Amino acid sequence: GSMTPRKVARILVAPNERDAARRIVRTTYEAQGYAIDESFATFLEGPSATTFGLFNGEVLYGTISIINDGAQGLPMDSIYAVELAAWRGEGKKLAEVVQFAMDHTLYEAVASPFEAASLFTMVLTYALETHIDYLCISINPKHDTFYSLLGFTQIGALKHYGTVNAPAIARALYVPEWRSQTLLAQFM
């Protein structure tokens, strides 16, 4: 599916779609040597979470979720709590984008995060509709430079993320003026 492609990005609602989303995350993280923790699944079946999916002609190949700052906090809190405390004091709506995974076997890849562009648009629209102030991410240092181009400013140092047993930096983006934080906005 690359010369007659059909890519569908939508909210995952059916229990079997969410199981399949968890399966992609599980396989992807095991291949990259990340640990799978049951805390992420907990957050996702909670009220303040939303899972998106990416379909190659009806088979799911990619997924991304977003967790809203509620009474259960954010997964970031175990590592980057005090980096968020200032914003929480000012009464800022925060949300963490989480469990982003693509299965490279199910999509004719570039041989790459920019092939999840439609998943990102869905996260961005959600953030502009929910009236979210700061969109937070904790990412593997290898994609650090990519998300910096996307306009995410570094808010946390390079630490060890115990949940994943892998290194992480924290980045955040001010959604209400996202176009002023990204270089790609010069081309529109």
Ligand X SMILES: CCCCCCCCCCCC(=O)N[C@@H](Cc1ccc(O)cc1)C(=O)O
User: What's the CA gap between 14 and 101, in Å, rounded?
Assistant: 18
Residues in binding contact with ligand X, number by CB under 6 A: 19
Binding mask 124-153 for ligand X (x = CB under 6 A): x------------xxxx---------x---
Q: Closest approach of Cβ 116 to ligand X, in Å?
A: 8
63 CB-near residues (< 8 Å, 6+ apart): 12, 21, 24, 25, 51, 52, 53, 54, 99, 100, 101, 102, 119
Residues in 74-103 at the binding interface with ligand X, rule: CB under 6 A: 97-100
What is the smallest separation between the CB atom of 165 and ligand X, expressed in angstroms?
A: 9
Q: How far is the CB of 18 from ligand X (least distance, A)?
A: 15
- Pick the closer one to ligand X by CB: 1 or 81: 81
Measured torsion, CA atoms of residues 54, 31, 49, 86, in degrees rounded to the nearest 10 = -120
d(CA 63, CA 122): 11
Q: Where do contacts with ligand X occur on this chain (CB under 6 A)?
A: 34, 97-100, 120, 123-124, 137-140, 150, 161, 164, 166-168, 178
